[PDB]
Amino acid sequence: NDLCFTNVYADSFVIKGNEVSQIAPGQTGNIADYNYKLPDDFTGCVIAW
């Protein structure tokens, strides 16, 4: 709450349990490679509930 950001992006998708661990910069898998690749120099937060 003490930061000022220029643009904020909120990509939302429902996915399995282990693919929650899959999503991270510089990762791999059936989803991380062909469905959703985060940029290595990711500066942000991912959220799973």
Binding site: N18, G26, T28, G29, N30
Partner: protein, 48 residues
């Protein structure tokens, strides 16, 4: 034949197989297992 086995020996006697004179495409290794931990140390899985 290292992932389709049925009796992966106990840790007290770790079975060790040698892989040579062949071409390795680890996508078969990927699709034969719903992976839980792929911690590689000397080489990164992506460009393997």
């Amino acid at each position: 034949e290292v992932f389709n086995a049925t009796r992966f020996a106990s840790v007290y006697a770790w079975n060790r197989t040698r892989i040579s004179n062949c071409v390795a495409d680890y996508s078969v290794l990927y699709n034969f297992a719903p992976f839980f931990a792929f911690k590689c140390y000397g080489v990164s899985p992506t460009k393997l």
